[PDB]
Write a protein that binds this ligand. Structure first.
Ligand SMILES: NC(=O)c1c[nH]c2ncnc(NCc3cc(O)ccc3F)c12
Length: 167
């Protein structure tokens, strides 16, 4: 039993909800919140911009130190950093950004990072400003992630479409 509330169950391990991931994280304080990161951990917009703003820019300060030490992530890769006031940990996961021409096949590799954590609050990878089809992202999620994932979908119109079209 966990503290997530109001999710629709899609499969044995995948759950979905119309919610603002920032507000959901503040309420649940999950062990792991997933950020829709880019390889530079520059949290300018989308989910990343919103998660960072909620931390009063502490996420960005920590991220800049991480990059200065370790260099950029790989597309499809991830790193674990602090969750600040939102969660115990933040798993920064880089899905391909279609508006940069990156291979959509890397979306599966990106979701594989979730399997290193028993329970996660997450957005759909590569959705929103990363330019991928959220219906496809949900399909890859369900077919790749085996751990317990709670998906927060910001747009109410999009959520109903994902549910209604889910096979
Ligand atoms: N600034 C942001 O994007 C977000 C900030 N918090 C969030 N919490 C959950 N979902 C989000 N985006 C999902 C989304 C995907 C899509 O394809 C179209 C619209 C849309 F809203 C965001």
């Amino acid at each position: 039993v966990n503290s997530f509330s109001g999710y629709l169950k899609l499969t044995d391990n995948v759950y979905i909800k119309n919610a603002d991931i920032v507000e959901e994280a503040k309420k649940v304080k999950p062990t792991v919140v997933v950020n829709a990161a880019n390889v530079y951990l520059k949290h300018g917009g989308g989910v990343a911009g919103a998660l960072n703003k909620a931390t009063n820019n502490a996420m960005q300060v920590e991220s800049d130190d991480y990059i200065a030490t370790n260099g950029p992530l790989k597309v499809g890769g991830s790193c674990v950093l602090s969750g600040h006031n939102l969660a115990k940990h933040c798993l920064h996961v880089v899905g391909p950004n279609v508006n940069k021409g990156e291979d959509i096949q890397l979306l599966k590799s990106a979701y594989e990072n979730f399997n290193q954590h028993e329970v996660l609050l997450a957005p759909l990878l590569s959705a929103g400003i990363f330019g991928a089809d959220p219906i496809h992202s949900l399909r890859v999620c369900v077919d790749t992630v085996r751990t317990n994932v709670y998906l927060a979908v910001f747009d109410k119109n999009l959520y109903d479409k994902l549910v209604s079209s889910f096979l």
